[PDB]
Amino acid sequence: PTVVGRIPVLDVRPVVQRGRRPAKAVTGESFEVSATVFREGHDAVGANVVLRDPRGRPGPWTPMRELAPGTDRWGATVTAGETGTWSYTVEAWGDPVTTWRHHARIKIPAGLDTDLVLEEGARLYERAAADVPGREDRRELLAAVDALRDESRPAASRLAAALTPQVDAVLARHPLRDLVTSSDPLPLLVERERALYGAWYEFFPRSEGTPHTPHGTFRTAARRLPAIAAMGFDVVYLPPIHPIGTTHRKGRNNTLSATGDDVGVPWAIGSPEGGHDSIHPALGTLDDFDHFVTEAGKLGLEIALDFALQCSPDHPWVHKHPEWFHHRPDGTIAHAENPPKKYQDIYPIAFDADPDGLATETVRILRHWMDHGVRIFRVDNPHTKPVAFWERVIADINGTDPDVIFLAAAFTRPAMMATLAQIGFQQSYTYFTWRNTKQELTEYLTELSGEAASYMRPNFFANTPDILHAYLQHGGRPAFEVRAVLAATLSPTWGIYSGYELCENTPLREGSEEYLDSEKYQLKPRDWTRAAREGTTIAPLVTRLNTIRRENPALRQLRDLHFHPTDKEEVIAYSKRQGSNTVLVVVNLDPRHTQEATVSLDMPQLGLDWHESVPVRDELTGETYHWGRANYVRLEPGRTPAHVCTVLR
Amino acid sequence: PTVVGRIPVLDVRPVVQRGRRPAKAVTGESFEVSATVFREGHDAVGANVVLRDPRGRPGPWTPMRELAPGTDRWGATVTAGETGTWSYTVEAWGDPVTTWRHHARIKIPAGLDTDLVLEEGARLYERAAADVPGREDRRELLAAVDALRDESRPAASRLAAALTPQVDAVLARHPLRDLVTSSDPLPLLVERERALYGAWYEFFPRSEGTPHTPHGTFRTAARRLPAIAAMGFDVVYLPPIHPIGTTHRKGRNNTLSATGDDVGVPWAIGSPEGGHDSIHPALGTLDDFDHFVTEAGKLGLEIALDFALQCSPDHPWVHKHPEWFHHRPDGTIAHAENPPKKYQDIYPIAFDADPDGLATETVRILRHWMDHGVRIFRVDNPHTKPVAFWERVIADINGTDPDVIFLAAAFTRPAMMATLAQIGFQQSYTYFTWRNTKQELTEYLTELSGEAASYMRPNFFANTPDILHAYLQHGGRPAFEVRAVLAATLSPTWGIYSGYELCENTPLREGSEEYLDSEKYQLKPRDWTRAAREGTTIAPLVTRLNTIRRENPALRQLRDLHFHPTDKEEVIAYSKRQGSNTVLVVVNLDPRHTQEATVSLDMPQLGLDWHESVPVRDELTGETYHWGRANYVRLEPGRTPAHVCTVLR
Ligand SMILES: OC[C@H]1O[C@H](O[C@H]2[C@H](O)[C@@H](O)[C@@H](O[C@H]3[C@H](O)[C@@H](O)[C@@H](O[C@H]4[C@H](O)[C@@H](O)[C@@H](O[C@H]5[C@H](O)[C@@H](O)[C@@H](O[C@H]6[C@H](O)[C@@H](O)[C@@H](O[C@H]7[C@H](O)[C@@H](O)[C@@H](O)O[C@@H]7CO)O[C@@H]6CO)O[C@@H]5CO)O[C@@H]4CO)O[C@@H]3CO)O[C@@H]2CO)[C@H](O)[C@@H](O)[C@@H]1O
Ligand SMILES: OC[C@H]1O[C@H](O[C@H]2[C@H](O)[C@@H](O)[C@@H](O[C@H]3[C@H](O)[C@@H](O)[C@@H](O[C@H]4[C@H](O)[C@@H](O)[C@@H](O[C@H]5[C@H](O)[C@@H](O)[C@@H](O[C@H]6[C@H](O)[C@@H](O)[C@@H](O[C@H]7[C@H](O)[C@@H](O)[C@@H](O)O[C@@H]7CO)O[C@@H]6CO)O[C@@H]5CO)O[C@@H]4CO)O[C@@H]3CO)O[C@@H]2CO)[C@H](O)[C@@H](O)[C@@H]1O
Ligand SMILES: OC[C@H]1O[C@H](O[C@H]2[C@H](O)[C@@H](O)[C@@H](O[C@H]3[C@H](O)[C@@H](O)[C@@H](O[C@H]4[C@H](O)[C@@H](O)[C@@H](O[C@H]5[C@H](O)[C@@H](O)[C@@H](O)O[C@@H]5CO)O[C@@H]4CO)O[C@@H]3CO)O[C@@H]2CO)[C@H](O)[C@@H](O)[C@@H]1O
Ligand SMILES: OC[C@H]1O[C@H](O[C@H]2[C@H](O)[C@@H](O)[C@@H](O[C@H]3[C@H](O)[C@@H](O)[C@@H](O[C@H]4[C@H](O)[C@@H](O)[C@@H](O[C@H]5[C@H](O)[C@@H](O)[C@@H](O)O[C@@H]5CO)O[C@@H]4CO)O[C@@H]3CO)O[C@@H]2CO)[C@H](O)[C@@H](O)[C@@H]1O
């Protein structure tokens, strides 16, 4: 057997780890399948993509086209349907009809061997007819055969009868394919829509209490859910909801010693009251948690829980499973580190004494929360547990419950980030918060929407409890507005951490990305009613962005994204498309100064002629403009962060 | 199982068609094996390459290093030995000693838990000692253990005794490796030296005749061999040596009708006198061919025959095996084309009626010439026969005779060129003749010496019977000198077609790359004795270039090549290295005007300090210079095409 087939079809993409891991999609998502296809000699080739579903049923006829002249790189768009494990193949073939037409278009006018050329055509069309299933299609081709062979008609008329649009249609649907050659199947894992598309809101339930009981419960925190749904969110991410240790508990502002009433850090999980399968007693009971999940569900909100595989020193595991920790010669366990950050309140887990016990217990815990309606987990610090451990855990959970979504909070180096996505994490956090200039955004999004999209689905959190970027610190409310527009329009999944709406931007100190008086170490009551009354919240802009996303299918996908040039360093422009829906976005990245620029649209990329002019509506204001190849924009921080425009038809 | 191991080792390179085809090397050749290696958490990792020979014997200890900070991309140089099918693996591991040192270097000065840290070290060094085979090495590590545990000495002195250079040496050779994880083996095909390295000379034996018998024979053409060996060539490439058809024979200058004594084109193979297994009767007999091969061998010359799988209309196959040709509806066979070039003297072969018969007969023909000492074949127009056909033929021949070298004359698009090399062609022709500016040469050679070197070995013919580039047409003798220096110093395999030495550069017409009065269509006697006597040949420069190659191992490899900046568009500089041999080349690409430039050497790339100064000898002149970071050069066309300098050691 030869590696290469009769008609070479090589290096089919997407591919992940050389075919050993699936490429990714979600239901309704379109992506490009490509390949290198060519043949020996000068005759034409064709190619097509056969996408097969979980029961092996092939999809529709999907012909490919050469993507750029001279490259022999071919492509076509496919669309994923129902969830499960799919496969895709590229078929390549000699295209004798195209070859014959090209010869005939030249030889018939020149008068060179014309009876012979037309007779060659007739025999091809005869072979074409025989392979066609439809009876009226077959009759069309046989009529062209007889016209080709009618030696009483002039040569140019006999030929023209084989080149009608009615004949082209039969052959475009059922072409004559010589020497059909297949690639080996590549795997595709199709997951639910929420894995790619959704808006996320993070808050601490304990902060939403009362004057008489400052520490919030699930019952009091449920009152926040209606406002979260009104801002157009789909997922509520809760920090750890378990008991919190007392030994080495941290105080306010990440000080080493907790005082009397200090609540500690939710990530320091475990006490005598319970571990990862228990509820913090100040939050309420498991029953109260069910009522919270039920109320969320009625508002169209899914709950995502933090899963943080680590322990306070008071966690039951410390004595029940000592072999799950690394001990030093004196018996002590070294607290976790991520230098120069120290985590004196927690122990990390060791994996090499009892890997089986840890995996068994991990999937038991996840299944417990799954039984109470949690179908999404934000996995804290996945990059400090072994990569193969997560691969096992995710395969075990998704083997019985393929709807469960895991989000990797992998704030680490690129290779680990990529690997975690490739071994099965449905979503990843990204370097988004550290991409603020036009060049940084353009480069990074070109990476995320290109090759990485076959294995990674990004979740653009504009802030997190650990990340208040200098851009927001120095820019104030106009910077919050810019980052919300960017996050919501550049990824189909974005999110914010509570307080973002209020433009909370006071850092711990200069050159830090921590918040002053961080919610991680203290209760943080906020006057939501007052901020709404006084207009000192950007909640309306957040709400409008989420409504724009819900109404424009182009913003519910990742891969179709193009950047259009402007003549100002501070102004960035881009478009996204999905069927007949086109969204065009222009953002002023300067939060202090007004910017005027000329935006020069690559018009072919919008499906339009260079000289054309199209109406657009800015969905932030309701204003209509008329934009063509070159358009003046004026963007004033505080009044207009950006234009977010739909192309009107 | 999990796809990912305990310590991730991912994306090992080189790789060809995802591991389904071997990467390439030759005996004595060095190349880099690389991989992505990292682990969870902050602790250090190490890696090493295990290269295994055809009997499975592992090579020496080959530790890898991280190639650039923050990339997690690791590499090391391996060297191929004996010919055959090898394999390579990357092993990755936790490096606990490096981890412990990094902690100890900080914690011991700071005074934090010092007894505990040193006791942790002692236990690691104890584990290290146990795995070491040498008895004096083991004693060194156990002495460091006792020093680490001596609680009567100060902490900094106990530590320092574990960090001596004597201890470092033991651990660099025999490190303590945790959680050793392997990649899956990748294949490596190691071929003989000639596949990568050699100088080739093409000539037509029929042109080397006498006054009484103008059509040369093998007996008369053997008298040309001594001068070919004196120019330092290793391979003689002969155009087809078979009978030549009479039907549609071409005349002089590619005219359609041959006159009385016109000899025709060697590539129009076959007559009633025989086919591809026969000798043209005007060349002599098989016995005369054996004498020619024997005389070549005595001069250190190997013969390479053209194998051109195509037929004149008089070839016996036309009537014996009609199914080996495509016939039109009237029974005629269309002559071969490569438009707008027409080949009215030949028929192409069709492969889909009798693929088995064609492969069987093809390997029979090749084996016949192999029995008469031909171990190298130049395959004409491989890109017009199926790719899988060559894959089958090459695997069959190399399965019994792995020393046979096939050279692909694939003047075609990049994808086909690459694929032919990947399916087993030992060597390829390249786009060299169409790379003449500094930018064109720098870009193309960076491609050939980088990733393509794992599957392709280039043969730089400065001219061929079908390619006289405009650069040579317009530049005259100074241009011939430049292209010879470039070809001989940039690839370990180069060649010329006879007449290049004489600076034959008259084209068929303006804008053509054909020669006027081409040797393809006529006998071309050359007065070699007269040109040598009159100094109108660049044979001496060719001879010197080949001697320089024979004396400098850096010029007998491909992969180690670096371009150094100059401040003139017409002056190009580069270096090549192999062990302690370094060659530096500076070429003036202007054949009409003298060029003076400053050559600014990247000194670290030569293994040297920025402020250093090193003696070099120009091997073209014998002159010695002293060159550092910045060097004036003056290059005058006709006197000095280039400097070809060795670094004196
Ligand atoms: O008796 C029979 C017959 O015998 C004789 O004929 C023999 C010859 O003696 C024998 O040597 C041989 O020669 C054939 C050869 O086998 C054929 O393939 C063909 O090759 C020609 C070719 O047809 C020409 O067009 C020309 O192509 C060059 C090109 O000029 C040059 O620029 C370059 O181009 C490549 C470029 O450098 C690359 O970068 C790349 O381009 C990329 C772009 O960069 C990218 O941006 C994007 O656009 O994609 C592009 C790729 O698509 O690729 C470019 C090419 O694709 O290289 C090409 C290819 O080398 O020159 C070649 C070489 O001459 O014809 C010759 C000559 O016939 O076989 C015949 C038959 O046996 C005798 O001569 C005859 O009279 C007798 O009848
Ligand atoms: O009760 C216990 C504990 O609870 C709390 O702590 C929690 C947190 O609440 C929880 O969220 C989480 O946070 C951890 C996180 O899991 C850790 O990974 C870590 O992450 C930090 C990180 O340590 C920082 O260094 C910083 O990293 C950024 C970096 O600043 C940023 O610039 C960027 O860097 C990447 C760069 O952008 C890329 O281009 C590329 O760079 C390339 C270069 O381009 C190339 O030229 C060459 O140089 O190679 C480079 C590659 O190396 O990659 C760069 C990546 O290195 O991205 C990095 C990574 O995101 O910030 C991150 C994020 O904060 O620490 C956080 C915070 O602790 O887990 C803990 C524990 O449960 C509570 O806070 C604590 O007090 C309590 O004790
Ligand atoms: O369509 C979105 C846009 O709609 C509305 O804009 C309208 C303007 O408000 C209105 O005035 C008009 O625009 C005129 C403009 O008034 C006029 O002054 C002129 O603009 C000049 C600048 O004055 C000049 O400084 C220079 O500015 C830039 C230049 O654009 C840039 O390419 C580069 O060279 O730097 C220069 C200096 O910074 O040139 C421009 C013209 O190119 O001409 C404008 C053309 O019409 O009409 C607008 C609607 O078409 C909204 O008010 C606005 O917020 C929305 O963004
Ligand atoms: O080492 C290899 C080299 O050895 C020999 O060169 C020596 C020369 O023979 C010798 O004369 C001397 O070179 C002097 C030169 O004589 C003197 O004129 C000066 O050169 C000036 C140019 O006159 C001036 O036009 C300008 O030229 C370039 C410049 O180099 C370039 O960087 C750019 O700016 O364009 C300019 C315009 O074309 O500047 C240069 C000086 O930078 O100084 C030279 C200093 O050396 O010493 C040479 C050293 O060995 C061989 O003769 C020669 O063939 C070999 O290549």
Numbering used by the authors:
A (entry chain A), B (entry chain B): 15 to 663
Provide the publication's sentences verbatim:
GlgE is an α-maltose 1-phosphate:(1→4)-α-d-glucan 4-α-d-maltosyltransferase (starch synthase (maltosyl-transferring), EC 2.4.99.16) and a member of the carbohydrate-active enzymes database (CAZy) GH13_3 family. It is the third and defining enzyme of the four-step GlgE pathway that is responsible for the biosynthesis of a branched α-glucan. The key contribution that GlgE makes is to preferentially extend A chains, limiting the opportunity for GlgB to introduce a second branch into B and C chains. The enzyme consists of five domains, four of which are typical of the α-amylase family.
Co-crystallization and soaks of a different catalytically compromised E423A variant of GlgE, which lacks the acid/base catalytic side chain, were carried out with various substrates and/or substrate analogues. By using mutagenesis to prevent GlgE from slowly hydrolyzing malto-oligosaccharides, it was possible to obtain a structure with malto-octaose bound to the active site. The occupancy of the donor subsites −2 and −1 together with subsites +1 to +6 indicated that this represents a product-bound structure that reveals the locations of the first six acceptor subsites. An essentially identical structure was also obtained by soaking a crystal with maltoheptaose except that the +6 subsite was not occupied. This showed that it was possible to obtain a product-bound structure in the absence of a donor substrate analogue. The product-bound structures of the E423A variant of GlgE had an additional malto-oligosaccharide bound at a secondary site located on domain C. In each case, five glucose residues were well resolved, clearly showing that they that were wrapped around Tyr-646 of S. coelicolor GlgE. The non-reducing end of this malto-oligosaccharide occupied a pocket on the surface of the enzyme, precluding the ability to accommodate any more glucose residues at this location. By contrast, the reducing end glucose residue was flipped relative to the other residues such that its α-anomeric hydroxyl projected into solvent. The likelihood is that malto-octaose/maltoheptaose was bound to this site but that three/two glucose residues at the reducing end were not well ordered in the crystal.
